[PDB]
Amino acid sequence: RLTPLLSGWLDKLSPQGNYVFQRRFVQFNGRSLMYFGSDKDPFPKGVIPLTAIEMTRSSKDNKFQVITGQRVFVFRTESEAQRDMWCSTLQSCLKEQRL
Longest dimension (CA), the chain: 38
Where in the sequence is the domain holding 33, given as residue range(s)? 4-99
9 forms beta bridges with: 25
Sign of the torsion angle spanned by Cα atoms 93, 65, 40, 32: negative
Inter-residue contact 29 to 38 (CB < 8 Å): no
Experimental technique: X-ray
Q: Which residues, listed in sequence order, are joined to residue 11 by a DSSP beta bridge? A: 23, 76
In one-letter notation, the amino acid at residue 28 is F
Q: d(Cα 3, Cα 58) in Å, to the nearest integer?
A: 21
The CA angle 74-23-34, to the nearest 5 degrees, is 60
Count of the separate structural domains present in the chain:
1
